[PDB]
């Protein structure tokens, strides 16, 4: 039973049934951001982008003394658990991605490119399947 089956409050556990919703999306595969397909962008499932990014639907339950906002993460949130060196670094890729996620309407799927740019960031934890068998073809270490 992962996190899967692990739901918080309602800050989640409401905005993955409502994100099933609004976006009638799977809930399965935002449900998986939890779980540490990070590296699994939007690249594959936009939706997971989206749920994610409704998942800060009321910033009140992720932000009660304002820990953060989504988008635009306050200094607490890229630095309680942030690096050093992701502080600028981000800057890096962010600059790169913010640059190419500009305020369209579709934030949905523009904003998300950033929130999940720097999320490339962790996919980079300690392990870094640059090449990972996908499809089994000559590519990755099959």
Known sequence: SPEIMKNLS???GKAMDQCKD???????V???????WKDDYVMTDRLAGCAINCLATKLDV????????????????MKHGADE?????????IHGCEKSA?????????????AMCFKKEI?????????DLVIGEVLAEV
């Open 10 to 12: 309602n800050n989640f």
């Open 85 to 93: 060196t992701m502080a600028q670094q981000l800057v890096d890729i």
């Open 62 to 77: 992720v932000d009660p003394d304002g820990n953060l906002h989504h988008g635009n993460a306050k200094d607490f949130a």
């Open 22 to 28: 609004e976006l009638s999306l799977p809930d399965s």
């Open 102 to 114: 500009p305020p369209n309407d579709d934030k949905c799927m523009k904003t998300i490119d950033v």
């Open 123 to 131: 996919h980079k934890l300690n392990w870094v399947p640059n090449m």
């Open 30 to 36: 935002v449900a998986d951001l939890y779980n540490f």
